[PDB]
């Protein structure tokens, strides 16, 4: 009967907590799902999303652009060391490669 | 007086060690190595015996497969002697470094 406050606002997040809790309940992982588990997991997913969009926006600024296309995601992931170890066996579509010519091939 | 031409004892040791199934590392030095490089993760751990035996099995199998691929790299370079850049080529094509 009070005013409804969503669980994302109560924790200070941007990703939803109710949707993550539903997808854990309806996903055949365990029988019972605790209270703090979707809050922890939505915090982790928001951190990784912000960490990749920072570098992608920086590359998009350096190419004299406004929007972000898959080339900037490719450069952002492949230049960082730990994002490259996380996304190691992953193909990003319309991404291309990094410039790399071996030393013994140029005169 | 009697000496074998160099290569003969190498070939028959290849046959002798590919025929048997045993552990090829001494196990008290390996146990000390495991406890030492586990000491930097949690102080005063307490291993079982089958845990150290499982680690020794896995490590021996890894090194034998790495030496087979290293030997193929060295034969590809038209040599016989194995050099460490062959190890580097094998571990970089495989996807480890």
């Amino acid at each position: 009967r009070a005013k409804a406050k969503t669980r994302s606002s109560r924790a200070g997040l941007q990703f939803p907590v109710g949707r993550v809790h539903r997808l854990l309940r309806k996903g055949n992982y365990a029988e019972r799902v605790g209270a703090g588990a979707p809050v922890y997991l939505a915090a982790v997913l928001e951190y990784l999303t912000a960490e990749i969009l920072e570098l992608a926006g920086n590359a998009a600024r350096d190419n004299k652009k406004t929007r972000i296309i898959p080339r900037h995601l490719q450069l952002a992931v492949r230049n960082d060391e730990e994002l490259n170890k996380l996304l190691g066996r992953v193909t990003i579509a319309q991404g291309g490669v990094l410039p790399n010519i071996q030393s013994v091939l140029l005169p | 007086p009697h000496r074998y031409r160099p290569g003969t004892v190498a070939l028959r040791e290849i046959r002798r060690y590919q025929k048997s199934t045993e552990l090829l590392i001494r196990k008290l030095p390996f146990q000390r190595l495991v406890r030492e490089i586990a000491q930097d993760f949690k102080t005063d751990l307490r291993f079982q015996s089958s845990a150290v035996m499982a680690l020794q099995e896995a490590s021996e199998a890894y090194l034998v497969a790495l030496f087979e691929d290293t030997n193929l790299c060295a034969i590809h370079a038209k040599r016989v002697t194995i050099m460490p850049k062959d190890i580097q080529l094998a571990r970089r094509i495989r996807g480890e470094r």
């Binding site: 922890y40 | 993760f41 949690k42 102080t43 005063d44 751990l45």
Partner: protein
């Protein structure tokens, strides 16, 4: 600056440290050891100042006096001695029941010491002679009571193993204010330790349901006897659930540190907002013993397996202390300097 961040060395000089405390100005550190030795360091010079052999059995309690010239301890041998920092001689010694928890001077007078025995009642003593006043306990059933003076020295807060806090007047034993802590729904919880700030009226209660409650020292005086106050701030950990071991306040009473009894970490909160601000990890498999805080400067002294660590801000330097006429910039700065391009004060020098 503010609350510390970096690990910054250690003091691996004398083994088997057990407890620690600072004086009012934070220039000394007294630490009892495993064989009756009290080693005092310095933070002005970062060196050992004085080592005094106390006893043969270990020391589990220490307290500085107000002037800083007298120590007091409570070893396993039921020995409470008013020591000296100059001579280093035991003066007073008389036996108690065999476990003793805590000793504490009066915060204005070096005559009154408040000894808390384990299986007894609080006993307020004098040092001009051998008087002792056994303070009253309400329940008289469990005999597990912790107590301490407040900041100024006007009252003594007492707590039992049933969650009933009492307020006794410091000299006439006036049971004037009391409350029972609202723990969950119906069950009551124990009281582990009571600590007080250095500036203001706030204090903290370390209960046994692993929740730390931050009260206000004036709401109790407002509510009077058998009132029901509620805490200003409730601080806990719910991931690891973290049963706590030791807590104290910051320099001006702004931040709270709380060491853990399971994992060797240190958690720091704000008092005003109330959010977690930093966790300070360390050696993974040790065990925590004591937590200190330097009263005017951000230094924490954590004892764990005889090793005292000091988290001290990681001073990194620059130029322009050598060449004051130069400004080491980072990127280009454009300007022109000027819009026109070309007494008898006698001050005491020996005033302290």
């Amino acid at each position: 600056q503010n609350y510390p961040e970096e690990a910054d060395g250690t003091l691996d000089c004398i083994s088997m440290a057990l407890t620690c405390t600072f004086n009012r100005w934070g220039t000394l550190l007294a630490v009892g050891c495993n064989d009756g030795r009290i080693v005092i360091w310095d933070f002005l010079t970062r060196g050992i100042a004085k080592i005094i052999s106390a006893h043969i059995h270990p020391v589990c309690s220490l307290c500085w006096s107000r002037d800083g010239h007298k120590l007091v301890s409570a070893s396993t041998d039921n020995i409470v001695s008013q020591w000296d920092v100059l001579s280093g001689d035991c003066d007073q010694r008389f036996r108690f029941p065999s476990p003793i928890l805590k000793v504490q001077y009066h915060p204005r007078d070096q005559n009154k010491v408040l000894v808390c025995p384990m299986k007894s009642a609080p006993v307020m003593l004098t040092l001009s002679d051998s008087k002792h006043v056994v303070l009253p306990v309400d329940d008289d059933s469990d005999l597990n009571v912790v107590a301490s003076f407040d900041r100024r020295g006007e009252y003594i807060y007492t707590g039992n193993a049933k969650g009933k806090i009492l307020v006794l007047k410091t000299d006439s034993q006036d049971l004037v204010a009391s409350f029972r802590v609202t723990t969950g729904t119906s069950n009551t919880t124990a009281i582990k330790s009571i600590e007080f700030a250095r500036k203001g009226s706030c204090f903290l209660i370390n209960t046994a349901d692993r929740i730390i409650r931050v009260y206000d020292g004036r709401e109790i005086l407002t509510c009077g006897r058998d009132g029901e106050p509620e805490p200003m701030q409730k601080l806990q950990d719910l991931v690891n659930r973290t049963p706590w071991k030791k807590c104290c306040f910051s320099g001006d009473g702004e931040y709270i540190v709380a060491g853990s009894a399971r994992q060797h970490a240190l958690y720091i909160w704000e008092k005003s907002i109330g959010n977690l601000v930093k966790i300070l990890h360390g050696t993974r498999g040790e065990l925590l013993l004591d937590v200190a805080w330097h009263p005017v400067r951000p230094i924490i002294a954590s004892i764990s397996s005889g090793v005292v660590s000091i988290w001290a801000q990681n001073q990194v330097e620059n130029w322009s202390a050598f060449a004051p006429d130069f400004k080491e910039l980072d990127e280009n700065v454009e300007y022109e300097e000027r819009e026109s391009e070309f007494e008898d004060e006698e001050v005491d020098v020996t005033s302290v």
